[PDB]
Design a protein around this ligand. Structure first.
Ligand SMILES: CCn1cnc2c(Nc3cccc(Cl)c3)nc(N[C@@H]3CCCC[C@H]3N)nc21
Ligand SMILES: [Cl-]
Ligand SMILES: [Cl-]
Length: 296
């Protein structure tokens, strides 16, 4: 029924546990309640909360309100957001205008810059993890990054050194947007968040990516096929008609493991495009004036 003093648990609104609609009874505000069975054999909720705390208050970071026990679950109470870019992607007939994608990209490079500024790498880029604010809120226009369960501190706290390079890192997440180097079992760094973004920007522009249908008998082999197709798809072909996207992807693909990405350059690739195309950054995304779903 209740999370901590004041948060009432509500209906299931999503599915390592479930997401519930919650209400702060003390403020009359709806909230998100991410639950996780206490009997989880591989818990992620507490480490995710810890990453959220580490992120603090950022533009497009979901506020977090409570982490505590909830019957036979552990609960994390955070800010209730709207649809994901994937949900929105579907409402927009699985393509987005260049303006939508550019407004998304400009934002999410800054979102990613911020995450990286807090000594974290994200490692779970995917449209489903980028949520607009709520249908009426001051933040419906803002694309928020969620789900920090797969994040990593890429700067070691004691030494203040970048994490060392390594390989034979096993593959587990979403294969569709992951960097080529993630496919090669390399330790992910800041570059890989940014490349995965580029893949997703291309997914949005094209409607699909050319490795998105690939199936294999094991998942290891499927990652391999997808990775092979990524390597075998020239950026110039993947990004035909989108020159700055190819420029973005080459840049991020060529980043050294340790290299701090030049976020300003990448953002300017896109803001110059945006300007040149005659676009106005007015948050008038493709899905504006559509019937968007609600959590509540
Ligand atoms: C804890 C991050 N978070 C905040 N708000 C979220 C969310 N809100 C909903 C859920 C279902 C429909 C709609 Cl429109 C919004 N969905 C959601 N799905 C994964 N995640 C959400
Ligand atoms: Cl009430
Ligand atoms: Cl996939």
């Amino acid at each position: 029924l209740m999370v901590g003093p004041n948060f009432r648990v509500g209906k299931k609104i999503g599915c390592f546990g479930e997401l519930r609609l919650g209400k702060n009874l003390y403020t009359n505000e709806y909230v998100a309640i991410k639950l996780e069975p206490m009997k989880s054999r591989a818990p992620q909720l507490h480490l995710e909360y810890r990453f959220y705390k580490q992120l603090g208050s950022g533009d497009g970071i979901p506020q977090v309100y409570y982490f505590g026990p909830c019957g036979k679950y552990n609960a994390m109470v955070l800010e209730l957001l709207g649809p994901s870019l994937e949900d929105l992607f579907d409402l927009c007939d699985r393509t987005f205008s260049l303006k939508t994608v550019l407004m998304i990209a400009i934002q999410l490079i800054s979102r990613m810059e911020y995450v990286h500024s807090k000594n974290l790498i994200y490692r779970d880029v995917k449209p489903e993890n980028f949520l607009i604010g709520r249908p009426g809120n001051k933040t419906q226009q803002v694309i928020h990054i969620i789900d920090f369960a797969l994040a990593k501190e890429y700067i070691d706290p004691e030494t203040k050194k970048h994490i060392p390079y390594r390989e034979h890192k096993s593959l587990t997440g979403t294969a569709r947007y992951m960097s080529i180097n993630t496919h090669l079992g390399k330790e992910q760094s800041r570059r890989d968040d940014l490349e995965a973004l580029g893949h997703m920007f291309m997914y949005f522009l094209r409607g699909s990516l050319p490795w998105q249908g690939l199936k294999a008998d094991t998942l290891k082999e499927r990652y391999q096929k997808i990775g092979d197709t990524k390597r075998a798809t020239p950026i110039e072909v993947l990004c035909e008609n989108f020159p700055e996207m190819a420029t973005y992807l080459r840049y991020v693909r060529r980043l050294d493991f340790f290299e701090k990405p030049d976020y300003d350059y990448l953002r300017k690739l896109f803001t110059d495009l945006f300007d040149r195309k005659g676009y106005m950054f007015d948050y008038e995304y493709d899905w504006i004036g559509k019937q968007l779903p609600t959590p509540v």
